[PDB]
Design a protein around this motif. Sequence first.
Motif, PDB file in Angstrom:
ATOM      1  N   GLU A  81      85.361  21.842  -4.879  1.00  0.00           N
ATOM      2  CA  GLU A  81      85.786  20.345  -4.525  1.00  0.00           C
ATOM      3  C   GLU A  81      85.302  20.332  -3.009  1.00  0.00           C
ATOM      4  O   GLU A  81      84.788  19.179  -2.603  1.00  0.00           O
ATOM      5  CB  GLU A  81      87.154  19.832  -4.751  1.00  0.00           C
ATOM      6  N   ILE A  82      85.578  21.259  -2.169  1.00  0.00           N
ATOM      7  CA  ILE A  82      85.211  21.258  -0.770  1.00  0.00           C
ATOM      8  C   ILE A  82      83.812  21.238  -0.671  1.00  0.00           C
ATOM      9  O   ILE A  82      83.000  20.718   0.304  1.00  0.00           O
ATOM     10  CB  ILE A  82      85.802  22.248  -0.108  1.00  0.00           C
ATOM     11  N   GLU A  83      82.991  21.916  -1.431  1.00  0.00           N
ATOM     12  CA  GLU A  83      81.780  22.222  -1.387  1.00  0.00           C
ATOM     13  C   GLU A  83      80.873  20.914  -1.837  1.00  0.00           C
ATOM     14  O   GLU A  83      80.102  20.592  -1.270  1.00  0.00           O
ATOM     15  CB  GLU A  83      81.104  23.407  -2.280  1.00  0.00           C
ATOM     16  N   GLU A  84      81.261  20.129  -2.824  1.00  0.00           N
ATOM     17  CA  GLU A  84      80.721  19.051  -3.386  1.00  0.00           C
ATOM     18  C   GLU A  84      80.994  17.932  -2.077  1.00  0.00           C
ATOM     19  O   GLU A  84      80.104  17.307  -1.946  1.00  0.00           O
ATOM     20  CB  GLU A  84      81.610  18.253  -4.658  1.00  0.00           C
ATOM     21  N   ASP A  85      82.128  17.937  -1.335  1.00  0.00           N
ATOM     22  CA  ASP A  85      82.414  17.000  -0.413  1.00  0.00           C
ATOM     23  C   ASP A  85      81.583  17.330   0.832  1.00  0.00           C
ATOM     24  O   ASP A  85      81.271  16.445   1.654  1.00  0.00           O
ATOM     25  CB  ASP A  85      83.841  16.768   0.079  1.00  0.00           C
ATOM     26  N   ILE A  86      81.284  18.736   1.202  1.00  0.00           N
ATOM     27  CA  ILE A  86      80.174  19.032   2.314  1.00  0.00           C
ATOM     28  C   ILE A  86      78.950  18.486   1.834  1.00  0.00           C
ATOM     29  O   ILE A  86      78.115  18.075   2.838  1.00  0.00           O
ATOM     30  CB  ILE A  86      80.319  20.568   2.512  1.00  0.00           C
ATOM     31  N   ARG A  90      76.874  16.164   3.959  1.00  0.00           N
ATOM     32  CA  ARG A  90      75.458  16.153   4.359  1.00  0.00           C
ATOM     33  C   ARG A  90      74.610  15.278   3.818  1.00  0.00           C
ATOM     34  O   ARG A  90      73.505  14.868   4.609  1.00  0.00           O
ATOM     35  CB  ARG A  90      75.226  17.594   3.626  1.00  0.00           C
ATOM     36  N   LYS A  91      74.919  14.729   2.596  1.00  0.00           N
ATOM     37  CA  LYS A  91      74.040  13.448   2.258  1.00  0.00           C
ATOM     38  C   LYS A  91      74.419  12.358   2.940  1.00  0.00           C
ATOM     39  O   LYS A  91      73.523  11.657   3.340  1.00  0.00           O
ATOM     40  CB  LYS A  91      74.426  13.199   0.716  1.00  0.00           C
ATOM     41  N   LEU A  92      75.611  12.113   3.594  1.00  0.00           N
ATOM     42  CA  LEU A  92      75.775  11.130   4.582  1.00  0.00           C
ATOM     43  C   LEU A  92      75.135  11.078   5.830  1.00  0.00           C
ATOM     44  O   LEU A  92      74.538  10.114   6.281  1.00  0.00           O
ATOM     45  CB  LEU A  92      77.509  11.058   4.848  1.00  0.00           C
ATOM     46  N   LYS A  93      74.833  12.410   6.295  1.00  0.00           N
ATOM     47  CA  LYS A  93      74.160  12.532   7.565  1.00  0.00           C
ATOM     48  C   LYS A  93      72.808  12.387   7.196  1.00  0.00           C
ATOM     49  O   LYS A  93      72.082  11.718   8.227  1.00  0.00           O
ATOM     50  CB  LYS A  93      74.230  13.949   8.113  1.00  0.00           C
ATOM     51  N   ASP A  94      72.229  12.735   6.093  1.00  0.00           N
ATOM     52  CA  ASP A  94      70.693  12.360   5.689  1.00  0.00           C
ATOM     53  C   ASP A  94      70.624  11.066   5.411  1.00  0.00           C
ATOM     54  O   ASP A  94      69.232  10.298   5.680  1.00  0.00           O
ATOM     55  CB  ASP A  94      70.190  13.227   4.618  1.00  0.00           C
ATOM     56  N   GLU A  95      71.510  10.191   4.668  1.00  0.00           N
ATOM     57  CA  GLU A  95      71.327   8.962   4.461  1.00  0.00           C
ATOM     58  C   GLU A  95      71.341   7.931   5.497  1.00  0.00           C
ATOM     59  O   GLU A  95      70.652   7.063   5.787  1.00  0.00           O
ATOM     60  CB  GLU A  95      72.475   8.334   3.363  1.00  0.00           C
ATOM     61  N   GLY A  96      72.275   8.323   6.379  1.00  0.00           N
ATOM     62  CA  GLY A  96      72.688   7.507   7.863  1.00  0.00           C
ATOM     63  C   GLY A  96      73.877   7.488   8.066  1.00  0.00           C
ATOM     64  O   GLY A  96      74.196   7.213   9.458  1.00  0.00           O
ATOM     65  N   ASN A  97      74.878   7.851   7.407  1.00  0.00           N
ATOM     66  CA  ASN A  97      76.424   7.644   7.517  1.00  0.00           C
ATOM     67  C   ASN A  97      76.891   8.850   8.288  1.00  0.00           C
ATOM     68  O   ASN A  97      77.515   9.565   7.699  1.00  0.00           O
ATOM     69  CB  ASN A  97      77.252   7.416   6.391  1.00  0.00           C
ATOM     70  N   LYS A  98      76.159   9.285   9.447  1.00  0.00           N
ATOM     71  CA  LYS A  98      76.823  10.460  10.486  1.00  0.00           C
ATOM     72  C   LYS A  98      78.189  10.150  10.800  1.00  0.00           C
ATOM     73  O   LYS A  98      78.819  11.184  11.201  1.00  0.00           O
ATOM     74  CB  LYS A  98      75.807  10.529  11.512  1.00  0.00           C
ATOM     75  N   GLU A  99      78.471   8.795  10.997  1.00  0.00           N
ATOM     76  CA  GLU A  99      79.996   8.675  11.438  1.00  0.00           C
ATOM     77  C   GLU A  99      81.027   8.982  10.278  1.00  0.00           C
ATOM     78  O   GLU A  99      82.088   9.399  10.763  1.00  0.00           O
ATOM     79  CB  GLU A  99      80.057   7.562  12.005  1.00  0.00           C
ATOM     80  N   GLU A 100      80.757   8.537   8.995  1.00  0.00           N
ATOM     81  CA  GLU A 100      81.684   8.691   8.061  1.00  0.00           C
ATOM     82  C   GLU A 100      81.664  10.066   7.768  1.00  0.00           C
ATOM     83  O   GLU A 100      82.859  10.575   7.126  1.00  0.00           O
ATOM     84  CB  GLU A 100      81.342   7.760   6.826  1.00  0.00           C
ATOM     85  N   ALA A 101      80.637  10.766   7.781  1.00  0.00           N
ATOM     86  CA  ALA A 101      80.410  12.246   7.103  1.00  0.00           C
ATOM     87  C   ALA A 101      81.627  12.933   8.206  1.00  0.00           C
ATOM     88  O   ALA A 101      82.313  14.152   7.614  1.00  0.00           O
ATOM     89  CB  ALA A 101      79.411  12.939   7.344  1.00  0.00           C
ATOM     90  N   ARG A 141      84.194  32.567   0.850  1.00  0.00           N
ATOM     91  CA  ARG A 141      83.485  31.284   0.539  1.00  0.00           C
ATOM     92  C   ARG A 141      83.990  30.217   1.341  1.00  0.00           C
ATOM     93  O   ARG A 141      83.402  29.255   1.788  1.00  0.00           O
ATOM     94  CB  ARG A 141      83.523  30.717  -1.097  1.00  0.00           C
ATOM     95  N   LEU A 142      85.318  30.101   1.599  1.00  0.00           N
ATOM     96  CA  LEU A 142      85.755  29.235   2.573  1.00  0.00           C
ATOM     97  C   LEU A 142      85.197  29.199   4.009  1.00  0.00           C
ATOM     98  O   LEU A 142      84.914  28.357   4.624  1.00  0.00           O
ATOM     99  CB  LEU A 142      87.390  29.280   2.520  1.00  0.00           C
ATOM    100  N   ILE A 143      84.845  30.553   4.479  1.00  0.00           N
ATOM    101  CA  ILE A 143      84.410  30.616   5.758  1.00  0.00           C
ATOM    102  C   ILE A 143      83.100  30.301   5.841  1.00  0.00           C
ATOM    103  O   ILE A 143      82.652  29.774   6.711  1.00  0.00           O
ATOM    104  CB  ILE A 143      84.308  32.192   6.131  1.00  0.00           C
ATOM    105  N   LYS A 144      82.009  30.776   4.772  1.00  0.00           N
ATOM    106  CA  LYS A 144      80.855  29.946   4.725  1.00  0.00           C
ATOM    107  C   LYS A 144      80.821  28.622   4.638  1.00  0.00           C
ATOM    108  O   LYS A 144      79.731  28.041   5.077  1.00  0.00           O
ATOM    109  CB  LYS A 144      80.169  30.841   3.481  1.00  0.00           C
ATOM    110  N   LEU A 145      81.804  27.977   4.006  1.00  0.00           N
ATOM    111  CA  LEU A 145      81.814  26.497   3.873  1.00  0.00           C
ATOM    112  C   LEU A 145      82.163  25.992   5.113  1.00  0.00           C
ATOM    113  O   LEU A 145      81.583  24.751   5.630  1.00  0.00           O
ATOM    114  CB  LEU A 145      82.863  26.019   2.837  1.00  0.00           C
ATOM    115  N   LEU A 146      82.985  26.905   6.088  1.00  0.00           N
ATOM    116  CA  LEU A 146      83.517  26.324   7.298  1.00  0.00           C
ATOM    117  C   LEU A 146      82.266  26.408   8.248  1.00  0.00           C
ATOM    118  O   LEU A 146      82.294  25.707   9.089  1.00  0.00           O
ATOM    119  CB  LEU A 146      84.440  27.166   7.691  1.00  0.00           C
TER     120      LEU A 146
END
Lengths: 307, 307, 307
Positions: A81-86, A90-101, A141-146
């Motif tokens: 779930e954390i990886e999907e939200d990461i 990441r999609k938000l930064k690429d799409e344009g929503n760098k503030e909401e990410a 995996r939590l650390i790599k996700l961090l």
Amino acid sequence: IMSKIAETAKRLADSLRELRRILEELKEMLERLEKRPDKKVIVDVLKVIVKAIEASVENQRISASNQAALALAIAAEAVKEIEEDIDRARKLKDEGNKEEAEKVLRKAREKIREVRDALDAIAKGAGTPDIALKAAELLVRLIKLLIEIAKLLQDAGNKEEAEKVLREATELIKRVTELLEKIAKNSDTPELALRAAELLVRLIKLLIEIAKLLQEQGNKEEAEKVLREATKMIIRVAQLLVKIAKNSDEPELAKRAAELLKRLIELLKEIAKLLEEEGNEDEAEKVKEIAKILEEAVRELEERIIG
Amino acid sequence: IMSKIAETAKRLADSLRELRRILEELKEMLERLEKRPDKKVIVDVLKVIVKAIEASVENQRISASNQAALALAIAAEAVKEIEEDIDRARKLKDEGNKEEAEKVLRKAREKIREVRDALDAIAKGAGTPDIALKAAELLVRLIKLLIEIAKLLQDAGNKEEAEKVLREATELIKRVTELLEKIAKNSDTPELALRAAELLVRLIKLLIEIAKLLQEQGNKEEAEKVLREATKMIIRVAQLLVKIAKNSDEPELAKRAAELLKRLIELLKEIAKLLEEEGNEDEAEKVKEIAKILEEAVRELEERIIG
Amino acid sequence: IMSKIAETAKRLADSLRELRRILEELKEMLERLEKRPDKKVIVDVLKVIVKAIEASVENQRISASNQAALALAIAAEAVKEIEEDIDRARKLKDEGNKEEAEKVLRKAREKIREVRDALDAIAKGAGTPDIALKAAELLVRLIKLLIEIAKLLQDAGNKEEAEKVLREATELIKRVTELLEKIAKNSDTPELALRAAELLVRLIKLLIEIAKLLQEQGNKEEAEKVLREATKMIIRVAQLLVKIAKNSDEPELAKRAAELLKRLIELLKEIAKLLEEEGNEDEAEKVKEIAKILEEAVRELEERIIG
């Protein structure tokens, strides 16, 4: 993980069957004591009461182990779930929503802390060491996700926010490292120590990716300290890897330690390469000196592989 | 939730250790009774048998609590699956498949009922009240997801289908409200009562969003009844919020009750605004009259904050 | 599944309450034995010790059942993760990454094997047969997901990779079939046997979709063998379906068996149609002969429905 849910369930089913059998023998001893009591016949009756409670304790032990396996699977789903939200942030930064990410990443960080607190608890109370290793495998995996979180913060420009995240993963690596060192120290079989060594090789590479990300922020003063922890950890792992291959049940455990010892060399090359970019070429050549120590350690292992 | 999996696991690990210790002392009492029996020495031996079973009961208690925490995490994942399928059915309405989304929403409704039956069961058998609050916190999400379902039905034109959904969430709000009221009534610490009050403030806002959605369908006759339940619930919560802040362990619990009491006022404004749109301005001014009652209640709380 | 988490939790809560009551009665018997001991008074005291352990055994039984329900829910989430990765690998084949999807499918296959090992373990140690049926219902989904994997391999051109996958699902169908046959044989109520029959009708259709996919690869020599297992299984199910409807608690169980017996006929038509495409028209007409046997079996059931 799901296979450990199977084993713990099958072993729980056996202990519960024997606990039900020892319950019927407890009631037969009620019949044996209803007919006629005695001063020494009671002794053999308490033998069943002891066997009844011990059958219950072992069942409550495997039950706690099965709950641990169920907790390891829920924790693995929590990492996904954390990886999907990461990837979503990441999609938000690429799409344009760098503030909401940045709000999605602060959620995942509080999530990572919560899954960490569970996995660390599951690791402590681990009747079987595979529960602890699987817990450490998810804490890795939590650390790599961090780390992936901090790289998005750095890509979004929140370098000051990413350093604290990288400092948090740096403290998480040490905690999991100490657990992995305890598992390897106390490992009865060479397989479990090698599994801890495989994760230790990853925690070093995670520690390296933190250092490079710390270099990208400009905090070359702390990436030095981080590379000092990676170079130290490589020495410990190499001591472990050489010892695992020396006392090898199967020779396949030595070759896998040879592959990992090569990885420690390669990871040590990037440390010297990163220390070169930091300017600390003096400590970098000393890092290469340790690499040539490990190379000789790998070479002598390959000689025992043939000799 | 994952942190509660940690605490329940750590406490389970302690009870299992003490249960194993009381097992060894049970076998030492077998030695103490094997050497020589007596009429009164047996009394002190049964003291260990009692301590053995009580150590087992407490372990089976925390084990049930750890399973509850594992059940709360699985239920949270179930809500996230429902939310993904709601956003998926929302995508189907936006993409064009308004007909197929109705099958996805009927699935999620049967899912919501199933997660509700579990969370309600987890709430009843809660040795720790945090198990019940976390269960109520997820039952709140099920209700808001039930509201988002009805809004998609209304947006898709299934107004008659959405009313029954809204009537189902209306009955779910009352059930969770009664649970939250019991948690707050029986709360030993003011923190737990405030956490129930924070969810009660949300159940009122959920009850309000049902009323507005019921107004959008045209069922202004039932949104009146629903706003009567929200206005009633605000009074109960305000009684609770004023009592929590009066007997405040820390003053921070009073300010948070002051923030919530402001929210009850604001939510009461929308009720009067919705009652105005329904035409019941007479009951709307009476709703504003309660808002001025709460305002005075908030004002006197801020005076104790300074005095 | 989540409702079974509710029932097992509620029953666990009851056994834990009675276990706590039998603990207090165990300590009252400590008082009854502290005042004055006797040779026969101890007998009635051990009656409580037996009731204490039996109350603990039953609690450890339902606790294992609640863990099983939690394991069935985690396994269901595991199937949904596999399904998301299958649709993801399906997207990769449609997008263009047919090479990377083969790594996603090999992951899901190792996942399917792991969820299978858990679900099969949960099925064996099932104090309640609904635990086994829900486990079989998810093992059915693993098989259909294994079929969807092989179709992507076939669509990607990995026909040799898909046959082994189809052979793996063929061996999984038999294993779940034997479990479903044991559940139906040992079913105390006709409802549970019909639920096993509904899954058996699906395992036959899964076995049929394997045969058609095996025909699409060109392995018409093994799809013959697979259709021989489907035609055999239909006979067993039809024997079961006719027996369930003969001894019907409610007539609704007979009509549902009539619907399933029609499905066995329809599935038997595709077998003969696929056997026609394989060229084995002789065995195909014999398959139609069994269909006319079942048709007469359905017709006589509808006569009892009216008579």
